[PDB]
Amino acid sequence: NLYQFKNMIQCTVPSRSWQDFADYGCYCGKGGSGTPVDDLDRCCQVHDNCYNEAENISGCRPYFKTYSYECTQGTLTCKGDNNACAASVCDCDRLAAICFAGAPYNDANYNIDLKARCN
Numbered sequence: 001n002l003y004q005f006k007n008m009i010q011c012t013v014p015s016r017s018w019q020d021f022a023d024y025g026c027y028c029g030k031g032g033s034g035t036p037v038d039d040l041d042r043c044c045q046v047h048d049n050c051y052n053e054a055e056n057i058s059g060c061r062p063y064f065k066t067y068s069y070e071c072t073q074g075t076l077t078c079k080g081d082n083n084a085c086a087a088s089v090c091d092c093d094r095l096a097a098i099c100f101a102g103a104p105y106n107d108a109n110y111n112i113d114l115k116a117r118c119n
């Protein structure tokens, strides 16, 4: 769920407030369309597409599904007790969190005008 994803981000990118990734580019946060503006945005595009794919699973609601995971000593792990939905969503979140840690963060790309720039 989003609370868990927030925690994944806190654990792979502790140097930033989680909310720095909640409204960035065309894909990080509410936005889900247009040109990814940079590599961080591309991380979010993949994440968004990953969620859309997980939503094909019956009863699978990525913002809400509580999965089983651990973040310890620099590593994120999706646990074995996860059902197909939980495993898929956890993997989406894990890969995105790792992606965020390796992407440059451009302040100019925070809170962009989605209606104008993400068609």
Ligand SMILES: [Ca+2]
Binding pocket: 027, 028, 029, 030, 031, 032, 044, 048
């Ligand atoms: Ca999004």
